[PDB]
């Protein structure tokens, strides 16, 4: 695989020139856009670009985005025609952010998919003849006034020929038929994922999903669905409640006919006392689990390890709605040691120092410092120039001349389970809308609880008590969160009812003691030991609905 090795060494050594070339490739055709004309960028000139083009947040350039979303010519901001939009997890004052998009995003994405396939096969053997049980989902598109579809990045891929006509090798070979993957009903599709996977269990040499929250759900759903799956296996008939015609036709063929011996074989595996190692006992030829376990997904590692008998957890890719950033070049590492190596062909990257270790104002990709934290700044192929990503990364090293980054967190996010990234700003709002029912009927922090599936939000409050009021304080707190939450909470089942746990009096003063025992009360708490002081000063619990 000499082509790959060469390709990678080239990418990682020539970082500076590739970036400078990329920048020219983006700027040159865009010099007559309204946006670039405004900032006097009449030619490729790197210092003029850095001097005169502003660093922006989503909010700074929103009037431009709204124009294209509403139907105005793409050439306001990009001479590469905007053919759609990406719906970000991140929000802007309630609404999801809508990033401009075209097929360059998928060119980059498929480049990354091919690259990471080569990285994986270099290190992991025994996968080239098997298939993957990948829990992949399509979310249905939202329509814009322009007539262009807004989708999630990964659905932008599934709904395209980049997916339909993908390469014909092991890495693109799944136990599930494409129809299952394309099913907009994810409850139906996940059931079918499991069912097709069980049918073809011996062939499974890997499993996973984009994020670890989803792999966890696949296993929890399996636990709650296995008797039904096995009946379908026994009979050779998919269950009637699956409405999707594509799933109906496609899964029926995988089933093929009554398999009462395979059903018994699976029933007997599932009936063991413990669920420990279940993934590997049902799919014994699995070599790894392919899923993101970095950032807030790290909270799922022990559970993954429990179900998977310490199969390697390979966390390959760091990407976003603005752009795909890069990959993990050391896939067999532990999750807490995962760094992502940005690829210089993805977009032109700058970085804003988030600490004292770098006193510069903004720096190029090749100038970032070891141990230093930065916020990435992206210039891409769809009309984004020098936009803040609102993530925080830490430089852990350099692979040749390619900086490697540990993902620290998304700026301002206090609560995450699954897809939702609830910002502090969202939590103030809702806890202002709870203060009303407490101001009429009759401090605070939060934790993300994933001890049960589905994970759920926990808010501590500092007030017997009625359960009209406090139950309705759970409700308003939920209903004032974002559409990502609500899709996760009401449609997908990735999130259960928000919990309100009332603190004792003085707990919200002896909490000012907590980090004193280390002012500003945290609106989230991760510290296991400080979860202790909270969990023992609860006088009552209440939930949403
Ligand atoms: N590999 C990863 N590890 C941790 N967080 C990630 C990873 N990939 C993406 N993210 C987070 O998910 C976000 C996805 O962006 P968007 O598609 O706009 O919702 C990023 O901005 C990061 O905050
Ligand atoms: O497509 C992916 O596999 C992916 C994974 C992590 C982040 C963004 C992504 O597009």
UniProtKB/Swiss-Prot annotation:
GO terms for biological process: benzoate metabolic process; cellular response to hypoxia; defense response; defense response to bacterium; detection of fungus; plant-type hypersensitive response; positive regulation of plant-type hypersensitive response; regulation of systemic acquired resistance. It holds the Pfam family GH3. Optimum pH is 8-8.5. Residues 1-26 form a coiled coil. Induction: By P.syringae pv. maculicola and pv. tomato. Induced by PAD4 locally at the infection site and in a salicylic acid-dependent manner systemically. Specifically and reversibly inhibited by salicylic acid (SA). Changing residue 478 to K: In pbs3-1; loss of conjugating activity, and impaired resistance to virulent and avirulent pathogens. The keyword Repeat does not apply. AMP binds at residues 88-89, 294, 317, 321, 340, 391, 410. Disruption phenotype: Enhanced susceptibility to virulent and avirulent bacterial pathogens P.syringae pv. tomato and pv. maculicola ES4326 with or without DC3000(avrPphB, avrRpt2, avrB, avrRpm1, or avrRps4) as well as to the oomycete pathogen Hyaloperonospora parasitica (downy mildew) isolates Emoy2, Hind4, Hiks1, Wela3, Cand5, and Wand1. Impaired hyper-sensitive response (HR) and systemic acquired resistance (SAR). Compromised salicylic acid glucosides (SAG) accumulation. Resistance is partially rescued by SA treatment. Keywords: Coiled coil, Hypersensitive response, Ligase, Plant defense. Expressed in seedlings, mostly in cotyledons, leaves, hypocotyls and sporadically in roots. Not detected in unchallenged adult plants, except in flowers. It is an enzyme of class 6 (ligase). Salicylate binds at residues 113-116. Its EC number is 6.3.2.-. GO terms for molecular function: N-(4-aminobenzoyl)-L-glutamate synthetase activity; N-(4-hydroxybenzoyl)-L-glutamate synthetase activity; N-benzoyl-L-glutamate synthetase activity; N-vanillate-L-glutamate synthetase activity. Interacts with the P.syringae pv. maculicola effector HopW1-1 (via C-terminus). Catalyzes the conjugation of specific amino acids (e.g. Glu and possibly His, Lys, and Met) to their preferred acyl substrates (e.g. 4-substituted benzoates), in a magnesium ion- and ATP-dependent manner. Can use 4-substituted benzoates such as 4-aminobenzoate (pABA), 4-fluorobenzoate and 4-hydroxybenzoate (4-HBA), and, to a lesser extent, benzoate, vanillate and trans-cinnamate, but not 2-substituted benzoates and salicylic acid (SA), as conjugating acyl substrates. Involved in both basal and induced resistance in a SA-dependent manner. Belongs to the IAA-amido conjugating enzyme family. This is 4-substituted benzoates-glutamate ligase GH3.12. It comes from Arabidopsis thaliana (Mouse-ear cress). The lineage of its organism: Eukaryota, Viridiplantae, Streptophyta, Embryophyta, Tracheophyta. The gene is GH3.12.
